[PDB]
Design a protein around this motif. Sequence first.
Motif, PDB file in Angstrom:
ATOM      1  N   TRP A  29      -0.295   2.725   9.783  1.00 37.69           N
ATOM      2  CA  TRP A  29      -0.540   3.676   8.694  1.00 37.69           C
ATOM      3  C   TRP A  29      -0.675   3.070   7.266  1.00 37.69           C
ATOM      4  CZ3 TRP A  29       3.015   4.574   4.738  1.00 37.69           C
ATOM      5  CH2 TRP A  29       4.350   4.261   4.990  1.00 37.69           C
ATOM      6  N   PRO A  30       0.175   2.140   6.757  1.00 40.87           N
ATOM      7  CA  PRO A  30      -0.024   1.681   5.365  1.00 40.87           C
ATOM      8  C   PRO A  30      -1.222   0.762   5.144  1.00 40.87           C
ATOM      9  CG  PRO A  30       1.931   0.661   6.292  1.00 40.87           C
ATOM     10  CD  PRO A  30       1.341   1.480   7.383  1.00 40.87           C
ATOM     11  N   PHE A  31      -1.895   0.377   6.234  1.00 41.65           N
ATOM     12  CA  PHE A  31      -3.032  -0.529   6.218  1.00 41.65           C
ATOM     13  C   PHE A  31      -4.369   0.155   6.536  1.00 41.65           C
ATOM     14  CE2 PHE A  31       0.897  -2.718   7.254  1.00 41.65           C
ATOM     15  CZ  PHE A  31       0.911  -3.733   6.348  1.00 41.65           C
ATOM     16  N   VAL A  58      -4.942   0.104  -0.825  1.00 39.16           N
ATOM     17  CA  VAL A  58      -3.665   0.307  -1.515  1.00 39.16           C
ATOM     18  C   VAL A  58      -3.913   1.165  -2.747  1.00 39.16           C
ATOM     19  CG1 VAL A  58      -1.819  -0.800  -2.864  1.00 39.16           C
ATOM     20  CG2 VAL A  58      -2.466  -1.729  -0.625  1.00 39.16           C
ATOM     21  N   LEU A  86       1.033   5.304  -5.014  1.00 41.27           N
ATOM     22  CA  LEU A  86       2.225   4.598  -4.535  1.00 41.27           C
ATOM     23  C   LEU A  86       3.150   4.117  -5.674  1.00 41.27           C
ATOM     24  CD1 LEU A  86       0.762   2.565  -1.500  1.00 41.27           C
ATOM     25  CD2 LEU A  86       2.160   4.631  -1.430  1.00 41.27           C
ATOM     26  N   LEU A 146       2.667   1.527  -8.024  1.00 41.12           N
ATOM     27  CA  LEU A 146       2.759   0.063  -8.034  1.00 41.12           C
ATOM     28  C   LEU A 146       1.898  -0.396  -9.215  1.00 41.12           C
ATOM     29  CD1 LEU A 146       1.924  -0.312  -4.220  1.00 41.12           C
ATOM     30  CD2 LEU A 146       4.193  -0.305  -5.201  1.00 41.12           C
ATOM     31  N   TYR A 205       0.322  -3.909  -8.931  1.00 39.93           N
ATOM     32  CA  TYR A 205      -0.357  -4.331  -7.701  1.00 39.93           C
ATOM     33  C   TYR A 205      -1.683  -5.022  -7.945  1.00 39.93           C
ATOM     34  CZ  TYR A 205      -2.119  -4.628  -2.940  1.00 39.93           C
ATOM     35  OH  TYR A 205      -2.615  -5.117  -1.753  1.00 39.93           O
ATOM     36  N   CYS A 247      -0.300  -8.542   1.564  1.00 38.38           N
ATOM     37  CA  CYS A 247       0.981  -7.905   1.850  1.00 38.38           C
ATOM     38  C   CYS A 247       2.147  -8.895   1.657  1.00 38.38           C
ATOM     39  CB  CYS A 247       0.962  -7.326   3.263  1.00 38.38           C
ATOM     40  SG  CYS A 247       2.278  -6.137   3.603  1.00 38.38           S
ATOM     41  N   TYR A 265       2.343  -9.785  -2.405  1.00 38.22           N
ATOM     42  CA  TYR A 265       2.907  -8.731  -3.228  1.00 38.22           C
ATOM     43  C   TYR A 265       4.356  -8.378  -2.845  1.00 38.22           C
ATOM     44  CZ  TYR A 265       3.563  -4.590  -5.971  1.00 38.22           C
ATOM     45  OH  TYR A 265       4.072  -3.686  -6.865  1.00 38.22           O
ATOM     46  N   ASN A 266       4.682  -8.422  -1.545  1.00 38.64           N
ATOM     47  CA  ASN A 266       6.015  -8.049  -1.094  1.00 38.64           C
ATOM     48  C   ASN A 266       6.926  -9.282  -0.805  1.00 38.64           C
ATOM     49  OD1 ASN A 266       5.457  -4.939  -0.885  1.00 38.64           O
ATOM     50  ND2 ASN A 266       3.824  -5.876   0.322  1.00 38.64           N
ATOM     51  N   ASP A 319      10.418  -4.020   4.976  1.00 35.90           N
ATOM     52  CA  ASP A 319       9.887  -3.208   6.068  1.00 35.90           C
ATOM     53  C   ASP A 319       8.364  -3.266   6.128  1.00 35.90           C
ATOM     54  OD1 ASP A 319      12.467  -2.417   6.845  1.00 35.90           O
ATOM     55  OD2 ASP A 319      12.428  -0.638   5.590  1.00 35.90           O
ATOM     56  N   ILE A 320       7.677  -3.270   4.976  1.00 39.47           N
ATOM     57  CA  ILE A 320       6.211  -3.366   4.945  1.00 39.47           C
ATOM     58  C   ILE A 320       5.712  -4.727   5.460  1.00 39.47           C
ATOM     59  CG2 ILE A 320       6.053  -3.985   2.468  1.00 39.47           C
ATOM     60  CD1 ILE A 320       3.709  -1.613   4.249  1.00 39.47           C
ATOM     61  N   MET A 365       6.039  -4.804   9.278  1.00 42.47           N
ATOM     62  CA  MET A 365       4.960  -4.031   9.878  1.00 42.47           C
ATOM     63  C   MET A 365       3.650  -4.839   9.874  1.00 42.47           C
ATOM     64  SD  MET A 365       5.872  -0.486   8.024  1.00 42.47           S
ATOM     65  CE  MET A 365       4.794   0.678   8.831  1.00 42.47           C
TER      66      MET A 365
HETATM   67  C1  LIG Z   1       2.354  -2.890  -1.614  1.00 43.09           C
HETATM   68  C2  LIG Z   1       1.962  -1.889  -0.524  1.00 43.09           C
HETATM   69  C3  LIG Z   1       1.190  -2.586   0.604  1.00 43.09           C
HETATM   70  O1  LIG Z   1       1.172  -3.987   0.676  1.00 43.09           O
HETATM   71  N1  LIG Z   1       0.506  -1.793   1.534  1.00 43.09           N
HETATM   72  C4  LIG Z   1      -0.247  -2.483   2.576  1.00 43.09           C
HETATM   73  C5  LIG Z   1       0.470  -0.407   1.581  1.00 43.09           C
HETATM   74  C6  LIG Z   1       1.457   0.418   1.236  1.00 43.09           C
HETATM   75  C7  LIG Z   1       2.819   0.030   0.871  1.00 43.09           C
HETATM   76  C8  LIG Z   1       3.871   0.764   1.425  1.00 43.09           C
HETATM   77  C9  LIG Z   1       5.186   0.408   1.162  1.00 43.09           C
HETATM   78  O2  LIG Z   1       6.280   1.090   1.632  1.00 43.09           O
HETATM   79  C10 LIG Z   1       6.137   1.897   2.806  1.00 43.09           C
HETATM   80  C11 LIG Z   1       7.533   2.227   3.238  1.00 43.09           C
HETATM   81  C12 LIG Z   1       8.107   1.162   4.114  1.00 43.09           C
HETATM   82  C13 LIG Z   1       7.452   1.183   5.471  1.00 43.09           C
HETATM   83  C14 LIG Z   1       8.069   2.188   6.403  1.00 43.09           C
HETATM   84  O3  LIG Z   1       9.375   1.698   6.748  1.00 43.09           O
HETATM   85  C15 LIG Z   1      10.305   2.595   7.216  1.00 43.09           C
HETATM   86  C16 LIG Z   1      11.624   2.195   7.108  1.00 43.09           C
HETATM   87  C17 LIG Z   1      12.628   3.027   7.565  1.00 43.09           C
HETATM   88  C18 LIG Z   1      12.338   4.249   8.163  1.00 43.09           C
HETATM   89  C19 LIG Z   1      10.999   4.658   8.266  1.00 43.09           C
HETATM   90  C20 LIG Z   1       9.989   3.813   7.797  1.00 43.09           C
HETATM   91  C21 LIG Z   1      10.601   5.957   8.801  1.00 43.09           C
HETATM   92  C22 LIG Z   1      11.230   7.109   8.576  1.00 43.09           C
HETATM   93  N2  LIG Z   1      12.366   7.272   7.796  1.00 43.09           N
HETATM   94  C23 LIG Z   1      12.391   8.464   6.955  1.00 43.09           C
HETATM   95  C24 LIG Z   1      13.476   6.416   7.757  1.00 43.09           C
HETATM   96  O4  LIG Z   1      14.604   6.619   6.943  1.00 43.09           O
HETATM   97  C25 LIG Z   1      13.431   5.185   8.662  1.00 43.09           C
HETATM   98  C26 LIG Z   1      14.828   4.569   8.763  1.00 43.09           C
HETATM   99  C27 LIG Z   1       5.472  -0.657   0.324  1.00 43.09           C
HETATM  100  C28 LIG Z   1       4.440  -1.397  -0.214  1.00 43.09           C
HETATM  101  C29 LIG Z   1       3.112  -1.075   0.043  1.00 43.09           C
END
Ligand SMILES: C[C@H]1C(=O)N(C)C=Cc2cc(OCCCCCOc3ccc4c(c3)C=CN(C)C(=O)[C@@H]4C)ccc21
Length: 127
Positions: free
Chosen positions: A40-42, A46, A51, A53, A56, A95, A98-99, A104-105, A108
């Motif tokens: 999903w985030p890919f 961006v 978001l 940022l 970014y 990814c 930047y991170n 978590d990102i 993934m």
């Molecule tokens: C720079 C940019 C970037 O590099 N890109 C590529 C795009 C966007 C982005 C997206 C980013 O964050 C997305 C959120 C982190 C990924 C999902 O991780 C989790 C972790 C924990 C849980 C869940 C998901 C799921 C459900 N819930 C509610 C939970 O509480 C559990 C425990 C950060 C940076 C970028």
Amino acid sequence: SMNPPPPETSNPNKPKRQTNQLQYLLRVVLKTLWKHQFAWPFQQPVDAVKLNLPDYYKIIKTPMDMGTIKKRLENNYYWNAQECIQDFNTMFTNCYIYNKPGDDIVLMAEALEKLFLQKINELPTEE
Ligand SMILES: C[C@H]1C(=O)N(C)C=Cc2cc(OCCCCCOc3ccc4c(c3)C=CN(C)C(=O)[C@@H]4C)ccc21
């Protein structure tokens, strides 16, 4: 602060061709990665505004995503399979830049990258 225009996905002046490798990239590689739970985030550029940022597009100067990669592959934008492979690497690399490791990102992107590197090992021979 604003988002840049999305990467070019169509150019009528560019030559088109179909290869067994480009077909494999969309029908096998793209299809496997798209449906993965961490994709999903890919799946789209961006969105630094939505978001929140602000820095970014100050760190990342070559943005890339699977949405752009898939649009380029549907438009016959790529001539060589290596152009698409570089685009996937650029998306993963952006990814990691930047991170931070352990994020978590980043975990993934690491799983998508491992699924991607396995697919490229089975890339059919040119025809
Ligand atoms: C720079 C940019 C970037 O590099 N890109 C590529 C795009 C966007 C982005 C997206 C980013 O964050 C997305 C959120 C982190 C990924 C999902 O991780 C989790 C972790 C924990 C849980 C869940 C998901 C799921 C459900 N819930 C509610 C939970 O509480 C559990 C425990 C950060 C940076 C970028």
